[PDB]
Amino acid sequence: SGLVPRGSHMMKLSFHGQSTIYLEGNNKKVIVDPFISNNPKCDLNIETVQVDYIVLTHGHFDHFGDVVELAKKTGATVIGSAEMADYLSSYHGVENVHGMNIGGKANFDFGSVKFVQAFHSSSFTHENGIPVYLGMPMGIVFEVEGKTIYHTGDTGLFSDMSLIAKRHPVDVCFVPIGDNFTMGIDDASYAINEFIKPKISVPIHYDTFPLIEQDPQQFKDAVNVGDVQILKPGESVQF
Amino acid sequence: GLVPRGSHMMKLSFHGQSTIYLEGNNKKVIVDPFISNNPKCDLNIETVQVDYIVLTHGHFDHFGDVVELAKKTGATVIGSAEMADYLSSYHGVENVHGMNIGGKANFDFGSVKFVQAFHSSSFTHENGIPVYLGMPMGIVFEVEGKTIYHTGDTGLFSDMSLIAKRHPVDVCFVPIGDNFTMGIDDASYAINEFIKPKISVPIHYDTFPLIEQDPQQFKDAVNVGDVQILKPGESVQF
Amino acid sequence: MMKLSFHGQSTIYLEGNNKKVIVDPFISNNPKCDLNIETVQVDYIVLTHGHFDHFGDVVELAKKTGATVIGSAEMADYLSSYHGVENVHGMNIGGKANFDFGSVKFVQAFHSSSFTHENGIPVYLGMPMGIVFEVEGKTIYHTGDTGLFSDMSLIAKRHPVDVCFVPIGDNFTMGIDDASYAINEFIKPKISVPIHYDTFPLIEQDPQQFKDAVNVGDVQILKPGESVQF
Numbered sequence: 212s213g214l215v216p217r218g219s220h221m222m223k224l225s226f227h228g229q230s231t232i233y234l235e236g237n238n239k240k241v242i243v244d245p246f247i248s249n250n251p252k253c254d255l256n257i258e259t260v261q262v263d264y265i266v267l268t269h270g271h272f273d274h275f276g277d278v279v280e281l282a283k284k285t286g287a288t289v290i291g292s293a294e295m296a297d298y299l300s301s302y303h304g305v306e307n308v309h310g311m312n313i314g315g316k317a318n319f320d321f322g323s324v325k326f327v328q329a330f331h332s333s334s335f336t337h338e339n340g341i342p343v344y345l346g347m348p349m350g351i352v353f354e355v356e357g358k359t360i361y362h363t364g365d366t367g368l369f370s371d372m373s374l375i376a377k378r379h380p381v382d383v384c385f386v387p388i389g390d391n392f393t394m395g396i397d398d399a400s401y402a403i404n405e406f407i408k409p410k411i412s413v414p415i416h417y418d419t420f421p422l423i424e425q426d427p428q429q430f431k432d433a434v435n436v437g438d439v440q441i442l443k444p445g446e447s448v449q450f
Numbered sequence: 451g452l453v454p455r456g457s458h459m460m461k462l463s464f465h466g467q468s469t470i471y472l473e474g475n476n477k478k479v480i481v482d483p484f485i486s487n488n489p490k491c492d493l494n495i496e497t498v499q500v501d502y503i504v505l506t507h508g509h510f511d512h513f514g515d516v517v518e519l520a521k522k523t524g525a526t527v528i529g530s531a532e533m534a535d536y537l538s539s540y541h542g543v544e545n546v547h548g549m550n551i552g553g554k555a556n557f558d559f560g561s562v563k564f565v566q567a568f569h570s571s572s573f574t575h576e577n578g579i580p581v582y583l584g585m586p587m588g589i590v591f592e593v594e595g596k597t598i599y600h601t602g603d604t605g606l607f608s609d610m611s612l613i614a615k616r617h618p619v620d621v622c623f624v625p626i627g628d629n630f631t632m633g634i635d636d637a638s639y640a641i642n643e644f645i646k647p648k649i650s651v652p653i654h655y656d657t658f659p660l661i662e663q664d665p666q667q668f669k670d671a672v673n674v675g676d677v678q679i680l681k682p683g684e685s686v687q688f
Numbered sequence: 689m690m691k692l693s694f695h696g697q698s699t700i701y702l703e704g705n706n707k708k709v710i711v712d713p714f715i716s717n718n719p720k721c722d723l724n725i726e727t728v729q730v731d732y733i734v735l736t737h738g739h740f741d742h743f744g745d746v747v748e749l750a751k752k753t754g755a756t757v758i759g760s761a762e763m764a765d766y767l768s769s770y771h772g773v774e775n776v777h778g779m780n781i782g783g784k785a786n787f788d789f790g791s792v793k794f795v796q797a798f799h800s801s802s803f804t805h806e807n808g809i810p811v812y813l814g815m816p817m818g819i820v821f822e823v824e825g826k827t828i829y830h831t832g833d834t835g836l837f838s839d840m841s842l843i844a845k846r847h848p849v850d851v852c853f854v855p856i857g858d859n860f861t862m863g864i865d866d867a868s869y870a871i872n873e874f875i876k877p878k879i880s881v882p883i884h885y886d887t888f889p890l891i892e893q894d895p896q897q898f899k900d901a902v903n904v905g906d907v908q909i910l911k912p913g914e915s916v917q918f
């Protein structure tokens with residue numbers, strides 16, 4: 212316990228399938244949208260994953276994923292909408308939640324989390340077929356170890372992507388390309404070129420299901436600003 | 451062995467509230483089928499033929515007869531992921547296709563792209579507890595070379611210009627009823643400043659006393675394209 | 689002088705043509721609220737959204753005063769059918785209605801809207817909203833609980849604003865930086881009042897940092913019970 216915490220390195224930021232990202236800030240571990248056990252393309256394993264924090268963009272099954280079991284096993288704090296925190300706390304018995312809402316910023320030991328708007332939906336559907344409403348869907352702006360990371364969440368194209376990116380210039384943007392349920396290739400590449408203009412773009416939310424199969428090279432070819440890193444599950448952003 | 455019917459003026463009609471009907475590649479599509487409980491609606495649940503039902507949002511005056519119409523016709527119901535789950539799991543609808551805002555899907559009639567809207571989306575059970583059915587939406591269709599923008603139930607928003615610049619619009623269906631949506635002034639502003647379609651059709655008025663409007667005031671206020679004030683049963687003229 | 693007062697969190701009160709209006713009546717459960725449920729007089733209750741800290745004492749206040757509750761379709765249906773409130777008027781975003789007090793127009797917001805029943809299952813109550821009032825020749829924009837959005841400029845350009853009530857608490861809404869940007873860049877009202885801070889430890893802020901950051905019009909840091917000075 213007398214050992215000094217591990218010193219600085221290249222910021223750790225990895226993609227794990229669908230909308231799942233993992234990052235470390237000040238030796239704390241953060242995961243977004245942990246769809247691990249039910250995504251066969253996800254390289255993570257809920258028995259071995261180490262996390263201090265879980266952040267949810269919205270409540271759909273392919274983002275909510277293993278949050279309850281993961282939080283209960285790790286003691287991780289779950290960060291989400293006010294509705295998401297009350298649902299996790301009062302319906303699922305998750306002990307450590309932090310409710311926020313759009314535009315809200317919070318400072319944690321790992322860095323900062325700010326929720327931003329998205330155009331999508333947010334619910335988890337129960338056995339009777341009734342969606343449970345879990346707030347407006349959101350994107351995330353992280354400030355971690357000097358890096359600004361914008362995870363758009365599941366979203367359609369919107370011009371305030373430019374307002375988010377102007378007010379919070381972006382090192383890394385994770386942007387969905389799968390179409391049907393989100394932007395496709397054309398809208399995502401327009402989002403990056405016209406509005407966000409990050410240093411690095413990573414396409415997300417494709418191939419997990421047949422309906423959202425896409426060739427991410429068509430995204431790369433359409434992006435004219437910064438660098439595109441087409442990450443396979445398990446791969447880290449190179450800064 | 452007969453070849454399917456060949457090409458004609460694109461078939462596109464208005465049926466009261468926000469109900470529109472269109473044909474693409476000999477497939478029949480209805481939006482927001484509020485038929486049996488809208489006495490101003492010219493259609494009849496027992497006779498209307500549809501291959502697809504598209505829902506902009508869950509409110510009773512749009513959801514309407516979707517369950518009984520889908521059951522009779524075998525039509526595919528296209529809507530939000532929440533609307534697809536609810537219809538399929540709670541109501542037993544056989545054929546659903548879930549989507550979400552910004553998603554585009556290709557069907558045998560043409561394409562459906564859902565876009566954003568500012569409103570609400572639920573269906574209220576008897577006990578006063580809404581069933582959440584996603585964010586409200588508009589629709590961009592591409593059918594037989596025509597781009598149709600149905601704005602859904604919505605307030606005015608500047609990204610109407612983004613939608614229209616990215617998908618230049620042949621016909622825009624825009625609500626004018628006020629109280630629950632844009633009224634005359636906001637809808638005409640939407641058309642003049644943001645959407646700039648070839649043809650505008652005002653919708654979502656007169657169905658209930660609270661949303662009675664003179665659509666001529668909308669026509670008078672619009673300075674771009676053509677305005678066609680359609681009565682229930684009337685077709686857009688191209 | 690038009691009567692317009694702040695009462696803690698996002699609660700405002702105004703009078704138009706002798707009719708009394710309250711927004712987001714979080715009275716009994718806000719120890720900083722100067723009002724008392726048993727003695728507030730109102731003809732109208734307007735709700736930006738369903739959260740406990742806005743919904744507040746709406747059912748009790750409505751049942752006691754006979755006030756008409758103005759909100760989203762979903763809020764009017766829930767209050768009427770679930771809570772048995774006698775007098776509701778359902779509206780939705782972009783809609784305007786004319787009352788004897790003046791007009792109410794709901795506008796967009798970025799937040800959430802529900803009231804949580806037992807077991808952490810929310811009752812959906814629509815999209816969250818702001819309000820544009822026109823009352824005794826004054827345009828009042830209550831942004832509701834919201835994040836920053838550029839259509840704040842569209843709302844303000846189409847409805848030039850005398851008074852803007854804008855949240856600064858952060859975590860659940862805009863903080864100081866985003867609110868002052870909203871006022872300076874988008875809304876540019878005659879008078880800005882910060883709201884939705886200090887009620888709970890998480891949303892404690894110094895409203896003086898908001899006043900210092902605002903370069904347009906006049907900032908009035910109202911304490912609960914104080915009136916806007918025209």
Ligand SMILES: Nc1ncnc2c1ncn2[C@@H]1O[C@@H]2COP(=O)(O)O[C@H]2[C@H]1O
Binds near residue numbers: 420
């Ligand atoms: N609750 C759920 N749990 C697991 N898989 C689901 C659930 N809901 C939908 N899916 C699947 O997830 C897929 C995503 O979109 P598809 O249309 O490809 O088909 C969907 C279903 O097969």
Ligand SMILES: Nc1ncnc2c1ncn2[C@@H]1O[C@@H]2COP(=O)(O)O[C@H]2[C@H]1O
Binds near residue numbers: 574658778
């Ligand atoms: N769930 C519902 N089912 C049937 N009619 C409804 C429902 N909700 C509202 N209405 C009626 O539809 C009308 C819409 O406009 P009004 O608010 O004037 O009055 C409303 C009611 O008369």
Ligand SMILES: Nc1ncnc2c1ncn2[C@@H]1O[C@@H]2COP(=O)(O)O[C@H]2[C@H]1O
Binds near residue numbers: 889
């Ligand atoms: N439904 C509720 N009823 C009463 N208090 C609540 C409710 N929801 C949240 N709170 C409290 O309100 C506080 C708002 O700020 P905090 O997030 O710090 O902590 C929150 C809770 O302690």
Ligand SMILES: [Cl-]
Binds near residue numbers: 371609
């Ligand atoms: Cl915008």
Ligand SMILES: [Zn+2]
Binds near residue numbers: 331332
């Ligand atoms: Zn989703």
Ligand SMILES: [Zn+2]
Binds near residue numbers: 273416
């Ligand atoms: Zn998703």
Ligand SMILES: [Zn+2]
Binds near residue numbers: 509630
């Ligand atoms: Zn509606």
Ligand SMILES: [Zn+2]
Binds near residue numbers: 511512603630654
């Ligand atoms: Zn409607």
Ligand SMILES: [Zn+2]
Binds near residue numbers: 737739799800833860
């Ligand atoms: Zn709130």
Ligand SMILES: [Zn+2]
Binds near residue numbers: 739741742833860
């Ligand atoms: Zn609040």
